[PDB]
Structures are given as C-alpha cells and as structure tokens.
Amino acid sequence: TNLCPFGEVFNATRFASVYAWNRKRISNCVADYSVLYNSASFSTFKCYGVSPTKLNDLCFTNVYADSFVIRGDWVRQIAPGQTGKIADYNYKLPDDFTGCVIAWNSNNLDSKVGGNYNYLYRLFRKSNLKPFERDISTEIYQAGSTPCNGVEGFNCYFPLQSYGFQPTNGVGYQPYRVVVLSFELLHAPATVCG
Numbered sequence: 256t257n258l259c260p261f262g263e264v265f266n267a268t269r270f271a272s273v274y275a276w277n278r279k280r281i282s283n284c285v286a287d288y289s290v291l292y293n294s295a296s297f298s299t300f301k302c303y304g305v306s307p308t309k310l311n312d313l314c315f316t317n318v319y320a321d322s323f324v325i326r327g328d329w330v331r332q333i334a335p336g337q338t339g340k341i342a343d344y345n346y347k348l349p350d351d352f353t354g355c356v357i358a359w360n361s362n363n364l365d366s367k368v369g370g371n372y373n374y375l376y377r378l379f380r381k382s383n384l385k386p387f388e389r390d391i392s393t394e395i396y397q398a399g400s401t402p403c404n405g406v407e408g409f410n411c412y413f414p415l416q417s418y419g420f421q422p423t424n425g426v427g428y429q430p431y432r433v434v435v436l437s438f439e440l441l442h443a444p445a446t447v448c449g
C-alpha cells in the first residue's frame with residue numbers, strides 16, 4: 256500500500272559530493288514514476304533497458320537511488336560506457352545497466368550566495384572504479400620519481416579537488432543535482448511495484 260520514499264531522495268536539503276555519493280534502497284512500497292516523468296523540473300531523464308512511460312507497469316526485486324551534485328558540463332559522463340575523471344574515479348555505471356539517470360539545474364537551490372559549500376571530487380587514482388564502487392579514502396597519491404610515502408610535496412598530490420563552480424555566474428559550470436535510479440531483476444519476490 257505505502258507510497259515509496261522518493262521525497263527523501265529528490266527534496267533533501269543538501270545533496271552529496273560526487274566522491275562519497277549517497278545510496279538509498281527502496282523496498283516494500285508502491286512506486287508511481289508518473290509524478291517523476293511529468294514533473295517539469297528535470298533537464299535530463301534518460302532510461303536504459305526500460306522506457307519511462309512503462310515504469311508504472313513493472314515490478315522490481317529491489318530498487319536503488321544514488322544522489323550527488325556535479326557541474327552541468329559533467330552530466331554527460333553519467334551514462335553507461337562513458338569516460339572521464341567522474342566516470343573513472345568518482346562514480347561508474349556498468350555496460351549492462353537497467354535504470355534511469357535524472358538531472359536538474361540547482362543554481363537556485365544551491366550556489367545562491369558568496370563563499371561556497373565544500374563540494375569535492377577525486378582527481379587522481381591508481382586505477383578505474385568497478386561499477387557502483389564507492390571510494391572515500393584520502394591517502395597521498397604518487398605522481399613522479401621516487402615515493403613520498405608521507406607529507407604532500409614534489410610529484411605527490413592530495414587526491415580530492417573542489418569543483419570550481421562559477422561565482423553565482425558563468426553558464427555551463429553551474430550546479431546540477433543528480434538522482435540515478437537502478438533496478439534489479441533477480442529471481443526473488445518483487446519488493447517494489449507500480
């Protein structure tokens with residue numbers, strides 16, 4: 256009977272950074288996706304392996320929603336088979352993805368004033384993430400001749416960097432909130448339905 260907790264995902268006070276992104280799991284509820292597709296707010300809402308006008312017919316073994324903030328020029332990396340620092344080192348979707356990516360401009364709800372809130376992404380890593388791997392470690396990264404094995408210095412870097420949004424200005428570099436819905440089809444009792 257109960258409506259699913261999408262309000263706890265889409266209307267939260269602050270969304271996470273793109274390293275250390277939030278994940279919500281959704282179960283034992285009715286998921287009406289019609290109020291998502293017919294909401295006016297969304298700048299992108301792209302679905303893979305399901306079509307949005309049919310989500311209200313389907314039932315899923317379990318549902319996940321992942322949420323974070325990125326610049327409007329990075330949202331193209333939030334798709335299967337993409338490449339770049341976000342897709343490699345911060346958040347990766349598998350090549351065989353069943354789910355939808357939803358994004359909207361948040362420059363009214365965030366970045367509205369002087370200073371900043373501390374949004375960080377990982378810029379350096381020794382190898383790519385696996386699909387849905389999350390990495391929150393902040394050990395020094397080596398980037399040159401000889402190990403530093405300690406303090407920051409010549410050819411060693413702290414792995415995180417700030418996004419550098421334009422100061423309540425610009426055009427493409429503004430903040431976009433993202434929610435990624437991922438749907439399971441494992442042969443067990445269907446915990447979410449339309």
Ligand SMILES: *[C@@H]1O[C@H](CO)[C@@H](O)[C@H](O)[C@H]1NC(C)=O
Nearest residue numbers: 260261262263265266290291
């Ligand atoms: C977010 O809040 C608005 C305004 O209260 C509401 O219309 C919308 O349904 C909420 N989002 C979800 C996913 O329910």
